[PDB]
Each structure stands twice: as structure tokens, then as C-alpha cells.
């Protein structure tokens, strides 16, 4: 155990999520991501069924880890004197949705539909497992470019799902809902749907709709790209000012714009050139 089990490669990125490196499990040459998180920079702590003091990120990841490939799986984790090291799966080749949109711009609706549908399935899986991500955005979505499969990452701002009000938040502000901005209160599912509305707009317009607090509170959506009326309708519904006016996940997935989704492999062959 320690660092005999893994060969460390290049740094893939760093930020509020820690420092993540490309790695390879020496036992079976499996591709992995090695994420280092400093103890001093961890705000939310939790406890495992076992009964050990670990970052909430570890608790949440264990709760959502299974055969379903829509969420990044935690393979192992280690504790060091001043940090925790998380071993995560790593698709190859891969590119996060932020970099993909930077390079290609606004996505064709068929592509956005496949991606958005897959994000919805991943978020539903998290909720079904009692986990709320709280930071859904393009930077936290990985694209497996050969299989056309999307994967949700970075649960470091997440929490256990509950039906009572949340009065804390440390996700991305520009994806946070008007009720958080004005009252510092939100409920899990409706806040998630709001961030999904921001994400959908982002996919079809190539940029997020709001930058300032005042724009979030006003909730007026202007489309800068040609976007179908059905897509605009869904976006505006997800971005309803009153949380109760937002659609449930079932309503989103039964929306006319969401019908006849491509399968991930069809998506890669047509749009990622597999
Ligand atoms: C699992 N994972 C992360 O948690 C992360 O924050 C990354 O930046 C990342 C990048 C590439 C591949 C996997 C990755």
C-alpha cells in the first residue's frame, strides 16, 4: 500500500477540487485519476459506515459507486498526515464538457440532447443513492470520447440528500438558484433542476446565461444562438423563478424536446467521430 500500487503521470488539473494526476494501477495497467486534497482546505467532513473521519466527498462517492458508468467511481482512497488521496476511474481518451464547448462552440441540438439526457440519468442515480452533487456544470462532466458516455465528477461541494431546507452552499455561484442568492435557502431537487437549466442553455448557446446576481434574480433568458422553441421552453421551465414551478426529473425527461435520444455509441460515431 501507499505509492507502490500506482505510477504517477502528468498533472491533469488543479483548483477547488484539489490536484488531480493521471495514473496507472500497476497491478493491471488500469487507467486512474489520483486526486490529492489538503486536510486544511476541507470544510465538510463525514463518517463512513465503518466509523472513520473522512471528507464528505469520500462518503458521497462510496454511496454512488456501482456498475452504472454515469458517475465516476472511487476505487480506493488513502490518508496521509496532511491530505487524503482518492483513486478514481479515468476514461481514455477524455475531455471535460467545458473544454469541449470551448473548442467546438454551441452544440447541435441532437448532441446536446444526448449529453443532457445522460447528465439527467447520472443526477437521478445520485439522488436515488441519497446524494446531492450541488455543483453540476460543464467543468464537472467528463466525456468518454470513444464511447460517447458522460461521467459526473467532483462531489466535493455535495451533501447527503434531504427533504428539508439547505442553508449552506459552496458550489458555483453562476449555477446557483435565485432563492440561494436572495434568501440563502434552497431545497435539493429544485436547485439541481435550476443548475440543469443553466447547463442546458450552456450546451446550446456555448455559454452560461447569467454572470451577475441581478441577472439570476431577474431570471430573464435571452437566446444568442438559434435554438428550437421546444428547447427554449424546457430551459425556461428549468429556470423558473419559483422553485415549485420547475419541472421534476420525470417532467424534464418526458418533455417533447427530450424524445428520441441517441444512444451514447451512436452519439460518438456521429458527433465525436469514433
Ligand atoms: C476523476 N477525475 C476528477 O475527479 C477530476 O477532478 C478531474 O479533473 C479529472 C480529469 C480527468 C479524468 C478524471 C478526473
Task: Report yes or no: 87 and 75 within 8 Å, Cβ to Cβ.
Answer: yes
Best of 11, 20, 64 for a ligand 1 pocket test (most atoms within 8 Å of beta carbon) = 20
Check 40, 135, 138, 144 and give the catalytic one. 135
Q: How far is CA 160 from the centre of its chain?
A: 15
Best of 153, 158, 172 for a ligand 1 pocket test (most atoms within 8 Å of beta carbon) = 153
Q: At what angle do helices 109-128 and 188-205 cross, to 10 degrees?
A: 160
Experimental technique used?
X-ray
**Known binding-site positions:** 12-20, 35, 89, 96
Q: Which CATH number fits domain 93-274: 3.40.50.10490, 3.40.1280.10, 3.40.50.2000, 1.10.510.10?
A: 1.10.510.10
User: 223: which strand partners?
Assistant: none
Sign of torsion over alpha carbons 195, 196, 201, 206? positive
Question: Could you identify the atom of ligand 1 that is nearest to the CA of residue 88?
Answer: 1
Task: Report yes or no: 258 and 251 within 8 Å, Cβ to Cβ.
Answer: no
CA distances from 209 to 19, 149, 175, 205, 217 (A): 29, 25, 9, 8, 12
Closest among 270, 272, 252, 251 to 262, alpha carbons compared: 270
As a whole number of angstroms, the distance between CA 142 and CA 73 comes to 12
Count of CA atoms in the C-beta half-sphere (13 A) of 228: 13
Q: Which CATH number fits domain 1-92: 3.30.200.20, 3.30.70.1350, 1.10.540.10, 3.10.450.40?
A: 3.30.200.20
Cell of 157: 461541494
Is 135 part of the annotated catalytic residue set?
Answer: yes
As a whole number of angstroms, the distance between CA 131 and CA 143 comes to 22
Question: Of all protein residues, whose CA lies closest to atom 12 belonging to ligand 1?
Answer: 90
**Known binding-site positions for ATP:** 12-20, 35, 89, 96
Backbone angles phi, psi at 256, to 5 degrees: -55, -35
Count of CA atoms in the C-beta half-sphere (13 A) of 271: 25
Backbone angles phi, psi at 16, to 5 degrees: -65, -15
Would you list the DSSP string of the chain? Answer: --SSSEEEEEEEEEETTEEEEEEEETTTTEEEEEEEEEGGG---EEE-SS--EEEHHHHHHHHH-SS-TTBPPEEEEEE-SSEEEEEEE--SSEEEHHHHHHHH-SPPHHHHHHHHHHHHHHHHHHHHTTEE-S--SGGGEEEETTTTEEEE---TT-EE--SS-B----S-GGGS-HHHHHHS-B-HHHHHHHHHHHHHHHHHHSS-S--SHHHHHH-----SS---HHHHHHHHHHT-SSGGGSPPHHHHHTSGGGSSPPPHHHHIIIII--
As a whole number of angstroms, the distance between CA 243 and CA 247 comes to 9
Question: Could you identify the atom of ligand 1 that is nearest to the CA of residue 154?
Answer: 4
Amino acid at each position: 500500500p501507499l505509492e507502490s500500487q500506482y505510477q504517477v503521470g502528468p498533472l491533469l488539473g488543479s483548483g477547488g477540487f484539489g490536484s488531480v494526476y493521471s495514473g496507472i494501477r500497476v497491478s493491471d495497467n488500469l487507467p486512474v485519476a489520483i486526486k490529492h486534497v489538503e486536510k486544511d482546505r476541507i470544510s465538510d467532513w463525514g463518517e463512513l459506515p465503518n466509523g472513520t473521519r473522512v471528507p464528505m466527498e469520500v462518503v458521497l462517492l462510496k454511496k454512488v459507486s456501482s456498475g452504472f458508468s454515469g458517475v465516476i467511481r472511487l476505487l480506493d482512497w488513502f490518508e496521509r498526515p496532511d491530505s487524503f488521496v482518492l483513486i478514481l476511474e479515468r476514461p481514455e481518451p477524455v475531455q471535460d464538457l467545458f473544454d469541449f464547448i470551448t473548442e467546438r462552440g454551441a452544440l447541435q441540438e441532437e448532441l446536446a440532447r444526448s449529453f443532457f439526457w445522460q447528465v439527467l440519468e447520472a443526477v437521478r442515480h445520485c439522488h436515488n443513492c441519497g446524494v446531492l452533487h450541488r455543483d453540476i456544470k460543464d467543468e464537472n462532466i467528463l466525456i468518454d470520447l470513444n464511447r460517447g458516455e458522460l461521467k459526473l465528477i467532483d462531489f466535493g461541494s455535495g451533501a447527503l440528500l434531504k427533504d428539508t431546507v439547505y442553508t449552506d452552499f459552496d458550489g458555483t455561484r453562476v449555477y446557483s438558484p435565485p432563492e440561494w442568492i436572495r434568501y440563502h435557502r434552497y431545497h435539493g431537487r429544485s436547485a439541481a433542476v435550476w443548475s440543469l437549466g443553466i447547463l442546458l442553455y450552456d450546451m446550446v448557446c456555448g455559454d452560461i446565461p447569467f454572470e451577475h446576481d441581478e441577472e439570476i434574480i431577474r431570471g430573464q433568458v435571452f437566446f444568442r444562438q438559434r435554438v428550437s422553441s421546444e428547447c427554449q421552453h424546457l430551459i425556461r421551465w428549468c429556470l423558473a423563478l419559483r422553485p415549485s414551478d420547475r419541472p421534476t426529473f420525470e417532467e424534464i425527461q418526458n418533455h417533447p424536446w427530450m424524445q428520441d435520444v441517441l444512444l451514447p455509441q451512436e452519439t460518438a460515431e456521429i458527433h465525436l467521430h469514433s
